[PDB]
Scaffold this active site. Structure first.
Site, short mmCIF file in Angstrom:
data_model
loop_
_atom_site.label_atom_id
_atom_site.label_comp_id
_atom_site.label_asym_id
_atom_site.label_seq_id
_atom_site.Cartn_x
_atom_site.Cartn_y
_atom_site.Cartn_z
CE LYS A 144 10.12 41.61 8.06
NZ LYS A 144 9.13 40.77 8.79
CE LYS B 63 4.62 40.88 10.81
NZ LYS B 63 5.77 39.94 10.84
CE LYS C 133 10.88 33.36 6.84
NZ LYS C 133 9.68 34.20 7.09
CG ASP D 200 6.51 38.53 7.60
OD1 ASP D 200 6.51 37.83 8.64
OD2 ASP D 200 6.96 39.69 7.57
CD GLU D 201 5.65 35.97 10.89
OE1 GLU D 201 6.88 35.82 10.70
OE2 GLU D 201 5.13 37.08 11.11
CG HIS E 275 7.85 31.37 10.70
ND1 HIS E 275 7.27 31.90 11.84
CD2 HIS E 275 8.63 32.35 10.19
CE1 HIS E 275 7.69 33.14 12.01
NE2 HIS E 275 8.51 33.44 11.01
NE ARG E 276 12.11 30.36 17.01
CZ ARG E 276 13.09 30.32 17.89
NH1 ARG E 276 13.45 29.19 18.49
NH2 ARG E 276 13.74 31.44 18.20
MG LIG Z 1 8.11 37.14 9.72
#
Ligand SMILES: [Mg+2]
Ligand SMILES: O=C(O)[C@@](O)(COP(=O)(O)O)[C@H](O)[C@H](O)COP(=O)(O)O
Ligand SMILES: O=C(O)[C@@](O)(COP(=O)(O)O)[C@H](O)[C@H](O)COP(=O)(O)O
Ligand SMILES: [Mg+2]
Ligand SMILES: [Mg+2]
Ligand SMILES: [Mg+2]
Lengths: 468, 468, 158, 153
Positions: free
Chosen positions: C9, C11, C35, C37-38, C130-131
């Site tokens: 963070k 994001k 990871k 961020d999406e 990632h959903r």
């Molecule tokens: Mg995320």
């Protein structure tokens, strides 16, 4: 005499007032306005400048060969009242293969940093024909673009798309189309216009291609866009160039604009050699520190224009001669424009004939007479001399100032680009382009712009807006 | 207040004294010494400079979008006594892909030519970390050459082979060997040294390779030669680079010297990207018109050094701070050298941390403390910040002035090249190199050069020659 | 024990250097997994190649300092297949140690075709599904959709 | 006003009712029908949605830079009767190269899963022309197929 006696042993090797023929072809000639930085007279400072600009240093080095002394730059003339020093540089010193930045490194390189001079301004240079044979010169000229545009007997009308930055590719293409369909022939990228994230370069090129196609179909007149190809590196510049080539525009409808001062003379020479069939648009952004009269150290606008012509630039900005927003006077800008446009000019101090053939050749005289008569020269006889470099007139120009600059220019053989002169017109870019064309027609017909605007609304609106 | 009220509608769009955070990462920051050319106050001229350097012109153009106004450069601070103006340039304006000449075209391009300003000098710039992430920076540094040379705790001793021009390849190689076998580590091409007909480039490279091989075998110490690769075009420059690469020297024993001002920033960036493992030697020949204090229009030496560091140059000449023959003072030269050598410096007006990470990171504090302690930083953590750019000290320097410049330098983290300081030594190039090494040893041991020369003949001869 | 992981963070808004620094800070502190961020992708202020290189350097530094291996999940969701495979190959040719990088794909937004393509082209790489956007299918407040169990089962099948 | 005073420090960085020009070209505009999922008012829930859909989390992280705050999505308008919230997303957040699923991941991604909202429906979006330049759009159209089929009117 006395100044010669003031010289030490090292300085005497770079001073020869009895040089028999400076114009014999062995020497490039340079006139410098020179004021010493302190405790050195004019001749001693000139000798240090010549040594630092050709072969030597502040001392005699023990590695100096007799062959090395032949490559010495020599002060062969001084005007004490004007503080002018003439230096003959053997052009053998310069890097082979037509390297112009090597010349600039020699003559306007380290010497600018020397504390021995308080003022060092390269006012003019003279290229011998033997030296001129070594360099490319322009391959695409203003005559080729005149043939492509079918524009003769008037200056090529151009514009710079304002705002300089912040427009998207679609908006930039729309502004270019608005100028083109209004009668304007030439549209140029602003000098920092590049692959910005909000105006991607490939999208800009494609949209400009579509806009130029639409304008050409609507007006029935060919149009030219000058693309800025100044990049971070060579690979990006050539990628952008190839992107322009594979758009694909009609040959002659696009020019390659390069920021010559910032991107470098290497970029200009590379663009000239890789694309001799493309108008190389030398943008001189950043030149002011070299050329501004307020700056005592640098080189004149005339020298910059001459070296741009030598490097192969098809055209270079020369200045509005004080009419526009750029400094500062006609004596520099108009002289530089005439020197780069003419087969032979005065200029500031040297009579520069851009012929590469014998001095008294009858064909050279015929070519000079034809060039004075505004006929196209060096087409079938390009070996004879250097092709002309087109002056480009920009900076704070509106249509109302079109007539005065020509009154200072003495001719109409130039590309004039007006960014704020058209895009700041109250009735849009097309109205500004129409006002510029109306002012050009008024100058061509001899009608005053105030009289001409009575039957031309765009010209009258431009006069009303640009007179206050 | 009053100056804000003097502004028209167009100028107000480029002036924001209520900018909440200039150091938010969105804006490069520029401080300009600005004196108006006439009829404009300081704020009006600053607004015109910001408009001409970011997006606008002398008027509001009708094509201006609301998105375009976001890209406006804004004057956010003015010192009236010093005639200083602060301008925040959104670095979104700059060409993507780490294009430095685009930045120079924006900020030190057209604005230098404006007649609205009688003085316009970019004194300092500040790069946000977000902007710093976009640019390469140096990849090969002074620490890598220190490791290759096995030279620590003293400045890398270098020379320029004098005469500057006129020596053959054999003579140049002989002079380079004479310096190298005398203890000197670094030998550089003079800035215009190129493929001249009397000193062909390939022969020069081969002879320099043989001379360096002989010097390395004789001394048991590695040596470095900086080759000038400034050419007419990119292809010649890369051909000369590959010629050096396929000589073949030991990796690290050769550096690529480029005339950054004349050959262009594109050449510097291209050399940086194509050869990240090679020391990129930025030669700043011709910089004086930009940087000379006598010239009111240009940019400071500090700004030039910072942009050279951004462009990826491994090292750049910074000046002897008035000790040598180049202008003119310590306040510019030493400040620029500290700013390009340090992880964080004062500098002139902006506190420039060259870290690309969070401002209060503990690892950033540790890296800054290590850099202050002269430990090598950014080796395993090159993402964190820009690698240091090595200052190169040259121009009218003899061994007698080695101690004073360090007294002004405050450190010994620099490459020092003396052309006339060694080759003008009365006992030859090897004697000059030995005298330079003796002066360096005297400084390292605290022994005064006059005392040290009693047991060292070369140092005494150098003192006797260079004291008059 | 569960594999300890983190999401960097903020994001969005971090540069490549700041992102790599945060990833190193988590890794050297004992954390194993970091990871993307999406939506973290090739944004102009955080270029994807620079992000991959800086993350590689930070992972190398953390691995040498801690003496423990580290895994980073890179978001490879792109506009099209070609960009996604370009980013994947950029990760592969960094070059990380095999197993130290996972491919993160926004399975809902980027689509199930991207998930299947990542699985088939890179069976030796941990495919991070990632959903993001799944809620309209799976939220209990939404009467129309499918349960989280169905989404997980089809992800495992894919 | 009162809802603004109900916000904490973290949520205040994602609420800007005095945004001068939402249509200046820097922002994609999104209108959300938003009903909070309990104990949060409309403004707090909208701030959480904007944070989760642009740059933030449920807290302020110490890695937040001033540049990161420039990418914050901001709630710039609210209809309290209709439960409508306007959020301006700086389209700099979006993946370059015309990545549409990245936009959907931002605006209709994780926020749909948030328990802080009981209803979250993106009713409409506005694309600035500067943002629209970034994306392809259709190349083959209904007019092309009409020309191929010779079917008009
Ligand atoms: Mg995320
Ligand atoms: O950005 C500009 O300032 C210009 O587009 C002019 O704009 P306007 O015509 O709209 O004022 C030109 O590039 C400069 O004049 C070049 O200077 P020079 O011709 O002296 O090289
Ligand atoms: O030709 C020259 O003048 C030098 O070789 C010095 O020679 P000497 O040491 O023998 O005098 C250097 O290139 C300049 O000093 C560069 O200037 P700067 O360092 O200011 O960039
Ligand atoms: Mg311009
Ligand atoms: Mg004849
Ligand atoms: Mg840390």
């Amino acid at each position: 005499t006395q100044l010669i006696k003031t010289l030490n042993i090292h300085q005497k090797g770079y001073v020869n007032f009895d040089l028999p023929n400076p114009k014999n072809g062995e020497y490039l000639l340079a006139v410098f306005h020179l004021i010493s930085g302190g405790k050195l007279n004019i001749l001693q400072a000139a000798a240090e400048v010549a040594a630092e600009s050709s072969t030597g240093t502040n001392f005699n080095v023990n590695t100096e060969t007799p062959f090395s002394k032949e490559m010495n730059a020599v002060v062969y003339q001084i005007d004490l009242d004007q503080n002018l020093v003439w230096i003959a540089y053997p052009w053998r010193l310069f890097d082979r293969g037509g390297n112009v930045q090597n010349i600039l490194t020699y003559i306007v390189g380290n010497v600018l940093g020397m504390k021995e001079v308080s003022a060092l301004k390269l006012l003019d240079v003279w290229f011998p024909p033997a030296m001129l044979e070594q360099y490319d010169g322009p391959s695409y000229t203003l005559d080729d673009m005149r043939k492509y545009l079918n524009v003769y007997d008037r200056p090529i009308l151009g514009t710079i798309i304002k705002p300089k930055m912040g427009l998207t590719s679609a908006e930039y293409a729309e502004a270019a189309y608005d100028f083109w369909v209004g009668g304007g022939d030439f549209v140029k990228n602003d000098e920092p216009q590049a692959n910005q994230d909000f105006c991607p370069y490939d999208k800009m090129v494609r949209n400009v291609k579509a806009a130029m196609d639409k304008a050409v179909k609507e007006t029935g007149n060919k149009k030219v866009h000058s693309f800025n190809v100044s990049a971070a590196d060579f690979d990006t510049m050539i990628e952008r160039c190839e992107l322009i080539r594979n758009a694909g525009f009609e040959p002659g409808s696009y020019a390659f604009l390069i920021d010559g001062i910032t991107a470098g003379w290497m970029a200009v020479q590379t663009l000239r050699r890789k694309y001799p069939d493309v108008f190389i648009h030398f943008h001189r952004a950043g030149h002011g520190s070299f050329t501004r009269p307020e700056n005592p150290i640098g080189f004149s606008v005339l020298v910059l224009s001459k070296f741009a012509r030598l490097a192969g630039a098809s055209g270079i900005h020369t200045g509005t001669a004080g009419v526009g927003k750029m400094q500062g006077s006609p004596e520099e800008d108009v002289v530089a424009a005439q020197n780069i446009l003419r087969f032979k000019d005065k200029g500031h101090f040297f009579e520069q004939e851009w012929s590469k053939i014998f001095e008294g050749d009858k064909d050279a005289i015929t070519i000079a007479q034809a060039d004075t008569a505004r006929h196209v020269i060096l087409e079938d006889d390009s070996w004879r001399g250097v092709k002309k470099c087109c002056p480009i007139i920009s900076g704070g120009l509106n249509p109302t100032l079109l007539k005065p600059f020509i009154d200072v220019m003495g001719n109409i053989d130039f590309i004039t680009t007006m960014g704020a002169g058209c895009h700041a017109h109250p009735k849009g870019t097309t109205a500004g382009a129409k006002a510029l064309v109306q002012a050009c027609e008024a100058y061509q017909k001899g009608i005053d712009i105030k009289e001409y605007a009575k039957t031309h609304k765009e010209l009258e609106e431009a006069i009303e807006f640009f007179t206050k």
